[PDB]
């Protein structure tokens, strides 16, 4: 679920997804259009694409299970579809952590739609 995604971001990236990634660039936040603007933005683009490929369950409300072992986030459960949702969120959380070096809210927060033309929308 999205609440779990927020949890993973805070666990892995040690940041609040709501407060740092809810309206960044063209893709960080609900939906998206145009070109991913930077590393962080592409992380979001990929996450959106990942959710878009999940069939059989709901990435927004379904709850998945995970544990922490060998210093990582391990997605589990007996439901392959829910495990897939967890993998999407896990990958995005790590991506945000790994690209904190270039995170730039001053340039990319509330970027604007004109800067994210529908004609430049990169396909998954």
Please give the full DSSP string across 34-82, using - where no structure is assigned: S---SHHHHHHHHHHHHHHT--SS-TTT---EEEEETTEEEEE-S-HHH
Among residues 71, 101, 73, 83, the alpha carbon closest in space to that of 8 is found at 73
- C-alpha–C-alpha distance, residues 48 and 2, integer Å: 12
Question: Which approach determined this entry?
Answer: X-ray
Other C-beta atoms lying within 10 Å of the C-beta of residue 90: 20
Q: Which residues are annotated as a binding site?
A: 27, 29, 31, 48
Sign of dihedral through CA atoms 9, 40, 83, 76?
negative
With respect to CATH, is domain 1-124 assigned 1.20.90.10? Answer: yes
* 93 in Cβ contact with 8 (< 8 Å): yes
Q: Which residues are the active-site residues?
A: 47, 89
Q: Which residues are annotated as a binding site for Ca(2+)?
A: 27, 29, 31, 48
């Amino acid at each position: 679920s999205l609440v779990q995604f927020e949890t993973l971001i805070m666990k892995v990236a040690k940041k609040s997804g709501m407060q740092w990634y809810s309206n960044y660039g063209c893709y960080c936040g609900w939906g998206g259009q145009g070109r991913p603007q930077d590393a962080t933005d592409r992380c979001c683009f990929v996450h959106d694409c990942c959710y878009g490929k999940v069939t059989g369950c709901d990435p927004k409300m379904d709850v998945y299970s995970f544990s922490e072992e060998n210093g990582d986030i391990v997605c589990g459960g007996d439901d392959p579809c829910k495990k897939e949702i967890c993998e999407c969120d896990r990958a995005a959380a790590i991506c945000f952590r790994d690209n904190l070096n270039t995170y730039n809210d001053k340039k990319y927060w509330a970027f604007g739609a004109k800067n994210c033309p529908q004609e430049e929308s990169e396909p998954c």
